[PDB]
Structure 1
Amino acid sequence: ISDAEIWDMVSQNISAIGDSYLGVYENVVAVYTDFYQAFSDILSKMGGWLLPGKDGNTVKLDVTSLKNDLNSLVNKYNQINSNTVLFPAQSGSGVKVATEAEARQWLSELNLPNSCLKSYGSGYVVTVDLTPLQKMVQDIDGLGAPGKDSKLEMDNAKYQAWQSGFKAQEENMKTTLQTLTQKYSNANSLYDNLVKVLSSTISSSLETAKSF
Structure 2
Amino acid sequence: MTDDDLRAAGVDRRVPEQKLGAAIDEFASLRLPDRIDGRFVDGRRANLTVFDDARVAVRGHARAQRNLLERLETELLDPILQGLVDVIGQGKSDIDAYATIVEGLTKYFQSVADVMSKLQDYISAKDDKNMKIDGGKIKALIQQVIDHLPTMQLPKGADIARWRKELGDAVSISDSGVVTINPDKLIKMRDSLPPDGTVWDTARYQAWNTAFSGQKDNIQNDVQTLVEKYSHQNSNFDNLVKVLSGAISTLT
TM-score (norm 1): 0.71
Pairing partner for 2:205 from 146, 155, 159:
159
> What is the deviation of 1:116?
2.3
What is the DSSP-based 3-state SS (H/G/I as helix, E as strand, rest coil) of the residue aligned with 2:199?
A: coil
Aligned counterpart, 2:222: 176
Task: For structure 2, list consecutive stretches of 5 or more residues without a partner in the other structure.
Answer: 1-77
In structure 1, distance between residues paired with 2:124 and 2:249: 70
Whether the 8 Å contact between 1:62 and 1:152 is mirrored in structure 2 is: yes
TM alignment of 1:96-111, pairs within 5 A: 102-111=159-168
1:169 and 1:126 mapped to 2: Cα distance?
22
Structure 1 runs not aligned, ≥5 long: 78-83, 90-95, 206-212
Match of 2:245 in 1: 198
C-alpha contact 1:87 1:103 (8 A) present in aligned 2: no
Q: Displacement of 1:199 after TM fit? A: 3.2
Are 1:86 and 2:152 matched, yes or no?
A: yes
* Number of matched pairs: 174
| Superposition RMSD in Å | 2.5
1:9 Cα deviation after fit: 6.7
CA distance, structure 2, for counterparts of residue 105 and residue 10 of structure 1:
21
Matches within 5 A, 1:1-212: 3=78, 7=81, 10=84, 13-14=87-88, 16-53=89-126, 55-77=127-149, 84-88=150-154, 102-112=159-169, 116-118=172-174, 123-140=176-193, 143=194, 146=195, 150-195=196-241, 196-205=243-252
Query: d(CA) in 1 for partners of 2:106 and 2:190?
Result: 21
| Matches of 1:175 and 1:181, distance apart in 2 | 10
For the 8 Å contact 2:192–2:212, the answer to whether it is kept is no
Deviations 1:19-56 (A, max 9, x none): 41122111211111111111111110011112333x24
Higher Rg: 1
Q: Distance in 2 between matches of 1:39 and 1:173?
A: 9
Distance 2:197 2:161 in 1: 43
Deviation, structure 1 residue 59: 1.3
Matching residue's letter, 1:197: L
Going by fraction, where is helix more abundant, 1 or 2? 2
Aligned equivalents of 1:186, 1:43: Cα separation in 2: 29
The answer (yes or no) to whether the contact 2:102–2:230 under 8 Å persists in 1 is no
TM-score normalised to structure 2 length: 0.61
For the 8 Å contact 2:192–2:208, the answer to whether it is kept is no
